[PDB]
Amino acid sequence: VSQLIDEVDRIASQAEFNKMNLLQGDFARGSRATSMWFHIGPNMHQRERVFIATMT
Amino acid sequence: VSQLIDEVDRIASQAEFNKMNLLQGDFARGSRATSMWFHIGPNMHQRERVFIATMT
């Protein structure tokens, strides 16, 4: 179980898309790191909220 | 379901055609915004009404 949880932590540290990291919870419910948006509109204000909690 | 309804609200608040929103119900039966007329006649005063209700 120690080995498996070490593998889980390794994955959480390395699981990434491009240079950003996701599983660290940098965009959690109350994460102070930064904020992300997927703009899906032809207007500068048209974008919505996406969140990813902390799963360490 | 809440996420889906939030998408519905985003569509309603963002649905527009030529910098004019449509799903807001600006052309409803009792709408106070304005009356939409499409002139199809070759003379004066042949306006044609179109009605779209609020879709929030």
Short mmCIF file of C-alpha atoms in Angstrom, two decimals:
data_model
loop_
_atom_site.label_atom_id
_atom_site.label_comp_id
_atom_site.label_asym_id
_atom_site.label_seq_id
_atom_site.Cartn_x
_atom_site.Cartn_y
_atom_site.Cartn_z
CA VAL A 1 0.00 0.00 0.00
CA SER A 2 2.97 2.32 0.61
CA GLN A 3 4.22 1.56 -2.90
CA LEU A 4 0.78 2.15 -4.42
CA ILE A 5 0.22 5.46 -2.64
CA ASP A 6 3.72 6.54 -3.69
CA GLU A 7 2.73 5.73 -7.28
CA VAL A 8 -0.47 7.74 -6.84
CA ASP A 9 1.47 10.74 -5.52
CA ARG A 10 4.00 10.42 -8.35
CA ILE A 11 1.18 10.43 -10.91
CA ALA A 12 -0.52 13.40 -9.25
CA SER A 13 2.77 15.30 -9.37
CA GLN A 14 3.52 14.39 -13.00
CA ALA A 15 0.04 14.16 -14.55
CA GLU A 16 0.10 17.26 -16.74
CA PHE A 17 -1.30 18.79 -19.91
CA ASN A 18 1.40 20.82 -21.69
CA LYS A 19 3.39 22.66 -18.98
CA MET A 20 0.37 23.22 -16.71
CA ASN A 21 -0.45 20.86 -13.85
CA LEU A 22 -3.98 19.73 -12.99
CA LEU A 23 -4.14 17.22 -10.12
CA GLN A 24 -2.31 19.60 -7.76
CA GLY A 25 -5.59 21.49 -7.32
CA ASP A 26 -4.28 24.82 -8.59
CA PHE A 27 -7.83 25.56 -9.78
CA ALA A 28 -9.75 24.11 -6.83
CA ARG A 29 -12.82 25.53 -5.09
CA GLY A 30 -10.68 28.02 -3.18
CA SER A 31 -7.26 27.73 -4.80
CA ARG A 32 -5.28 30.98 -4.75
CA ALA A 33 -2.77 29.93 -7.45
CA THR A 34 -4.53 31.24 -10.57
CA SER A 35 -7.73 31.03 -12.61
CA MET A 36 -8.43 29.41 -15.98
CA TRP A 37 -11.12 29.91 -18.63
CA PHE A 38 -12.21 28.22 -21.86
CA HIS A 39 -13.40 31.01 -24.14
CA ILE A 40 -16.14 29.63 -26.38
CA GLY A 41 -17.56 32.88 -27.73
CA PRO A 42 -16.84 35.39 -30.50
CA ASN A 43 -16.89 38.15 -27.87
CA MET A 44 -14.20 39.13 -25.39
CA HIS A 45 -16.52 38.55 -22.41
CA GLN A 46 -17.98 35.18 -23.47
CA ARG A 47 -16.25 32.55 -21.34
CA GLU A 48 -17.32 30.21 -18.54
CA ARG A 49 -15.94 28.71 -15.34
CA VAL A 50 -14.16 25.35 -15.04
CA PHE A 51 -12.71 24.01 -11.79
CA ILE A 52 -10.51 21.13 -10.65
CA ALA A 53 -10.26 20.29 -6.95
CA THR A 54 -7.27 18.99 -4.99
CA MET A 55 -6.82 15.21 -5.30
CA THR A 56 -3.49 14.70 -3.55
CA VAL B 1 -28.36 18.97 -14.17
CA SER B 2 -27.27 22.24 -12.55
CA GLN B 3 -24.35 22.44 -14.99
CA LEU B 4 -26.75 21.80 -17.87
CA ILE B 5 -29.10 24.55 -16.68
CA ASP B 6 -26.13 26.91 -16.31
CA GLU B 7 -25.36 26.13 -19.95
CA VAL B 8 -28.99 26.98 -20.75
CA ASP B 9 -28.59 30.33 -19.00
CA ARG B 10 -25.33 31.00 -20.85
CA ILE B 11 -27.06 30.25 -24.16
CA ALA B 12 -29.97 32.53 -23.26
CA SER B 13 -27.69 35.40 -22.22
CA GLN B 14 -25.35 34.89 -25.20
CA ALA B 15 -27.72 33.99 -28.05
CA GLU B 16 -27.39 36.87 -30.50
CA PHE B 17 -27.45 37.60 -34.22
CA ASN B 18 -25.75 40.71 -35.65
CA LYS B 19 -25.02 42.29 -32.24
CA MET B 20 -28.66 41.73 -31.26
CA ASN B 21 -29.79 39.15 -28.71
CA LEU B 22 -32.79 36.99 -29.58
CA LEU B 23 -33.44 34.60 -26.68
CA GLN B 24 -33.89 37.54 -24.28
CA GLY B 25 -37.44 37.97 -25.60
CA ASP B 26 -36.94 41.51 -26.89
CA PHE B 27 -39.62 40.75 -29.52
CA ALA B 28 -42.13 39.01 -27.23
CA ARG B 29 -45.86 39.72 -27.31
CA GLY B 30 -45.63 42.06 -24.33
CA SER B 31 -41.97 42.97 -24.78
CA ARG B 32 -41.10 46.60 -24.03
CA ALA B 33 -37.66 46.50 -25.68
CA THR B 34 -38.70 47.17 -29.30
CA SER B 35 -40.87 45.88 -32.13
CA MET B 36 -39.08 43.97 -34.89
CA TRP B 37 -40.34 44.75 -38.40
CA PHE B 38 -39.15 43.23 -41.68
CA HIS B 39 -40.12 45.45 -44.61
CA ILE B 40 -41.08 43.30 -47.61
CA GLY B 41 -42.97 45.88 -49.66
CA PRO B 42 -41.79 48.15 -52.49
CA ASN B 43 -43.52 51.20 -50.95
CA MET B 44 -43.85 52.97 -47.61
CA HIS B 45 -45.29 51.22 -44.54
CA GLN B 46 -45.30 47.51 -45.40
CA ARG B 47 -43.62 46.39 -42.18
CA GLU B 48 -44.00 42.76 -41.10
CA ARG B 49 -44.00 41.79 -37.43
CA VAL B 50 -42.15 38.82 -35.93
CA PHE B 51 -42.54 37.62 -32.34
CA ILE B 52 -40.03 35.70 -30.21
CA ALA B 53 -40.77 35.17 -26.52
CA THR B 54 -38.37 35.14 -23.59
CA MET B 55 -36.39 31.89 -23.53
CA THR B 56 -34.50 32.09 -20.24
#
